[PDB]
Symmetry: D2
């Protein structure tokens, strides 16, 4: 009933399923009693109401997928597979569309083909998708004098007061959008978009028309010839038709992640899983060792990652390892270094040494974005490439596994600067400069060479 | 906002759709200008706004799955596969939960094992799920004097006036629930719920504890032995770990179906319109007016479609459906869904089949043994309608191509456990029917 | 030369063998210095010359197939596969032809389908073929007063003195015939004769025209339905197109077996000796002297081996065989082949099984229902020995691991069609036995 | 009973199977009434006796294999697969040993891996093995004053009179040796020797230790990376474990090839097949258009090839096409050019044009040996490579398919001259210089480059 230009969709009040068990609830309550940074400031009663809704909705992922990912990540940890993680820096509800989702899935796949060939081993494909709807902020008041935008799960991007109020109905809107995206993602990956031959064709079309193309023709051709070799040998080409794309996001809004907790079915044992995603990580600003995010990560069975910035000490890294991998399950923990290209060569070696000596097997993954940011906020492609380069140099020097990358990207032709010639044009992100389709593929070729190198 | 128990969606600055090929536009407007039975009566302007929202959401299904289905249904049409369709008579937002969905997916898969074994050919598995949120009514006002319940996509089940107001915001709720359900059925089918060995284990648990169990032990053991045979022969079994479950519902609310249209990139001779609210949809008895909106809408979409055929069907009208809906003679584009009562199917269906077979088109003949037979149905009349249906086809040499059944995973009933519709067979009776029909397929 | 109906092979400038690892040499000479029963009596010098020829020919089988077999037999030993061994009682050079070989391969495969279905687990298929050219005799002189026929590897079947002279040149003829037969069984099994669907079709033709057919229709149909189930589930079926048929014979003529030894490149802890005249060989009742050449020879080769156990077997001797021949406790290296008469198997076999099971070694228990029961055998006593054998294992909780049977593709019998041995079951009776044993496996 | 050093093995006289049918026999008799060049000169009665023996022995190959090869050759003819044919120039009974047979099968496989990768399409693998026991001679009396050696099927290599008498018992000895070799070949190819990963390892070991190695490191590495790509993608690696190696030889001794004729089983129709081999070809000296070899080829259903030398006219080639492919079955006929590297660029184009205009699809295959022969008879590697090079140049100029190679080789480290530095050392052939293991693999790398080229 609006003169508004807004439809109001009623949130159906549906009877609840039985509660989670008690031991697990006591554990959980004790974890969530810890202080949590960067939480939305909506009322408790509204929060509980919205949580209750989410407690009975169909999950975004199911436990047995997560168990599967855990096994695949174990191989990454042991130096036999490589982790590729990429997607929007922030999803918006506005752009949570087929074209945009297709675009990101295809950019990620395109990268995966090149990395799989370059690494010469399987690539675990993890999208920042289907829930990356919440972000920290350091500042309470933005350049316009407004409450900061904290992502669509918390408030709206529009530069006005009303949009910036923290509204917990966005938890439900968030769930609907994540669920819908994930449905699309499963559909696309199982019905042809993730066909290897098709994906590499896009790679050839890139090499043929990009101004940088010439640089990557040899490797592109070599991949092509790899592929044809497979037909030529008459392989059962079934596993070439589909690919698995896992969902991930920063676990930031605890009202959301706790509402999406589920207990798996007996057949070992039933465990607590966060079914909002397949894997989640904890950001720089919320990884307080005695805070609720880390404690939450302790209780869930999903694989998890922690972002490690320039202030990290090898001692604190070791504590993360002891809190988050208390059973020595290889690949249950990923430590994600993001330090800046100027710093990674010095800062990372001691951390790796100290963590390796623990006997635990973590995944070392490089986030070359969140360390290299300087009208618009932009990042230089060269400094991005160089951080991955240094990251590889650390591991090669130490005999450890450079296990993957974490990268912020899109399928759109946006405008980061320096792929081939680069901002006022197409700066579309609701956050950080998002390394357009062409740059992420270039990075993939450059990292492939670091792997053959 | 939360305070008001609503999610507020702004419509201005929503991603729009590109313009249709002039000609699809024209054809689609022409189809929808025709009269449409059983439509909700909410205001145009509110409907438009809701449609505009759905025009920008992720689809429930994608074109290439629907194209894959079409090929699988072509095998059925040709007498080389069998179609099993089943699920809730009506889904409700209140039961759109992980256990309820698991249960239905399980029940369906359990049927499919038994049917696959008894048919000796693949079974195309289509659930009534992720959209079966709208039903027709013969009366406007019900037994309590209220505006009839028409399914959660239109109004609410509660017995009060305000709950029965037609609410367009239910288009968007219906979408969210559908796509959430679809996400789950894809996850489950691809990650272990659809493992053949696990599914038959439940059949074995049913045979061993149902009071009917005895009756079906022999067949259940034979199936078990057939499965073990597969390991014994070392046949490579990724294909035994997953199954495909396609989504379907009655295409009833044209405001919903039209908003979920999308255009393919093309490839068999140009761009097509696909209804991406489902993989396949059918048109019911009360909306199949030959020059009505629903039939004409079915003509403009690429999806496979079916049409329910009741006791007053003539062979001539059946032929007209076939010529309108299968104008290119694509096997399996059209399913004729017979629902006639077990007392009538033996007499009424043969002439229809003969006339239609003489057109040279290859439809799927599917038996809906429910909608012809508290409101309850006798199991024996249901089984008997499928039995009569099988006799017709045996007599004529035609393919008895499938069944369409209304069921659940729940232990439903009579005052005991009656749960938004006509009476499902419960999970047990579904399985039992599957066993019974597998004997029809063997005999 | 042709004029003399001979092929002339020069021995000087023949490719020699490299020297054995000193230690295999020593062990092999020690084994062969032991006394050997049932050996041909031809001159040393002629034997040596023939051996020298065989030392340089292509092997009949290669080490890695024998290693593959060992792994498949380990599954049998563990109660997870079943061993079917069968073929001519004695091959003859005169029947070593494409139709006769096809027939036997067919009959064996036909049995294997039925057994695979009835066992509900893989069947390891081992033919008596490509070398079963030597037999023991209890008498030196036969009913006609002639030196007994001992198989075409030693002398001729014709009833005359010159034909019964032991002729060492038969070692080389035996090799040529064996390797020619093996070539054919590999070709046939890999190129369509071993297609599961084609093989069951013959079973279906048997059920439909044998006068016994009625008896086996139910099972044959169940199998057929099990097969169709496999297509129906879309399971990928290269594995349904081919089968492995392993070669075996009684290791009897030590001049032959020793000349066909070859040395592996190694890999489980050094180089081994493999008898490449076959994949697997067994030692008969009359040559299994515990401190004799044959047993000691079996100890020096890597192949899987079996030993025939007759009515006078003690549990203690059985244990000694097991400790000598399976000294490393490798499941499936050793097959104990029980052959006791149907009147005796129920009493004599349990104690043997118990004692041997208590050693913690895992042998394969195989039933040879022939050699314990014109010289003819009653089908009913044969079936009954396998039946008794199954009862023993059911009673003890042990695996009834397989059968060893003497058969053919030919329509043999009694004065009508008697064809170099004891009476085979003919092709029909083999199949019938397979059906009968598959019921034992199901029941 | 010898003071001789010879064992005499009796040839068992075994009852016969039913005869071939009559139509097919009349056809056959009329074919064999034609004159035949280069036949052994043993008596007719001895010949018939030995033929009768061979008529009932188990066949060397079976019809359904041959049908399969026909289909695979159809794809070669249509430009979608590549034919590799190689082995001993002449097999001997002496060397018909496991080591030697393993050696040749592995050399052929090693070639196939490189060619399969370079061609980017399947390679049909055809050995000169299991019957290549007979050769033509131009001269009646050799340099020693003896009747020429005509191969082990006909007489013996030893420089003495008695050995050189043509003895038809060698038909049976030939059959036994061919049968035994073929048995080995099936065993090896089905049980691990033909495993792709294993074979390429030998290729890497070659690249690492050959003095030419350095030349081929890039391609070798690129293949390796192709292979690892296959694991990395998780392909059903079953078709990587085994390979098909067909048997072939020159059909020269008609007493042999006719004795090995068999009629296939009904299920189209039963046909005459020569089961001494999978495919056979007719040499330069026996391809008289109205002779028995060509007529024999007409009656059998096997795929066949004809060698085409420098005297070939495009007209005569067309006649071969019309006699031997009268039903237009693609790949039933292979025309095998062997012209010399100095001549192939001029002589071959007109032949191809004239044959292409017939509408038939033959396979064009290059025999770069039998045209480049000059104490010992040797061939220069460079002239061998150059003929293949020219052969490719003809087809590239004409838009036709360069369909394969036919090459004489071995697994032995023999001494041809010029792989890396090359005769008195290891000249072991009973015929023409046989291009040792290392040279044939080098040729394979060089031809691979012609295919990517
Ligand atoms: N399914 C395999 C191979 C594959 C299919 N499509 C892909 C797309 C990109 C990379 C690899 C693939 C994998 O995921 O690795
Ligand atoms: N994938 C095959 C076999 C199969 C797997 N799981 C199943 C469950 C039910 C029936 C069949 C199956 C199919 O869906 O048909
Ligand atoms: N390859 C499987 C299945 C099979 C193929 N052909 C067969 C013939 C008989 C029995 C089984 C089979 C096996 O040999 O066991
Ligand atoms: N079987 C496939 C792949 C293969 C297996 N082993 C090989 C050896 C060489 C070349 C290819 C192969 C083929 O023959 O092509
Ligand atoms: Cl009221
Ligand atoms: Cl006498
Ligand atoms: Mn970011
Ligand atoms: Mn209904
Ligand atoms: Mn016997
Ligand atoms: Mn030559």
């Amino acid at each position: 009933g609006a003169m508004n230009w807004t439809v109001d969709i009623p949130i159906d009040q549906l009877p609840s399923l039985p509660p989670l068990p008690t031991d697990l609830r006591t554990r959980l309550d004790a974890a969530l009693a810890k202080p949590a940074a960067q939480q939305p400031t909506w009322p408790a009663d509204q929060a509980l109401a919205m949580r209750t809704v989410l407690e009975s909705v169909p999950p975004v992922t199911v436990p047995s997928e997560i168990v599967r990912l855990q096994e695949q990540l174990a191989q990454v940890a042991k130096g036999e597979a490589f982790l590729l993680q990429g997607g929007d820096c922030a999803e918006t509800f506005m752009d949570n569309t087929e074209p945009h989702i297709r675009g990101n899935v295809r950019a990620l796949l395109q990268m995966a083909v090149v990395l799989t060939y370059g690494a010469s081993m399987p690539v675990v494909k993890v999208a920042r998708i289907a829930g990356q709807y919440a972000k920290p902020r350091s500042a309470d008041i933005d350049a316009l004098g407004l409450r900061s935008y904290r992502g669509d799960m918390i408030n709206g991007f529009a530069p006005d007061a009303a949009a910036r109020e923290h509204d917990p109905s966005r938890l439900v809107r968030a769930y609907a959008n994540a669920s819908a995206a994930m449905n699309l993602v499963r559909a696309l990956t199982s019905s042809g978009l993730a066909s290897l031959h098709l994906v590499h064709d896009w790679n050839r079309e890139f090499v043929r028309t990009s101004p940088a193309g010439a640089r990557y023709e040899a490797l592109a051709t070599e991949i092509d010839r790899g592929l044809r070799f497979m037909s030529a040998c008459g392989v059962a080409d079934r596993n070439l038709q589909t690919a698995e794309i896992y969902a991930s996001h920063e676990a930031l809004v605890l009202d959301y992640e706790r509402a999406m907790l589920r207990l798996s079915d007996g057949d070992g044992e039933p465990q607590l899983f966060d079914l909002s995603a397949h894997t989640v990580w904890i950001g720089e600003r919320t990884r307080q060792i005695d805070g609720a995010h880390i404690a939450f990560a302790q209780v869930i069975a999903n694989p998890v990652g922690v972002k490690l910035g320039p202030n990290m000490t090898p001692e604190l890294a070791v504590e993360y390892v002891e809190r988050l991998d208390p059973h020595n399950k290889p690949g249950r923990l990923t430590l994600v270094s993001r330090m800046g290209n100027h710093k990674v060569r010095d800062l990372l070696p001691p951390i790796v040494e100290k963590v390796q000596a623990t006997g635990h097997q973590v995944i070392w993954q490089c986030d070359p974005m969140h360390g290299n940011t300087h009208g618009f906020k932009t990042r230089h492609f060269d400094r991005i490439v160089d951080e991955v380069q240094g990251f590889f140099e650390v591991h090669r020097a130490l005999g450890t596994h450079p296990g993957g990358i974490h990268v912020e990207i899109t399928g759109e032709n946006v405008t980061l600067g320096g792929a081939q010639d680069i901002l006022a044009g197409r700066y579309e992100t609701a956050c950080d400069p998002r390394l357009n389709t062409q740059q992420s593929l270039e990075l993939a070729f450059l990292v492939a060479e670091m792997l053959r190198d």
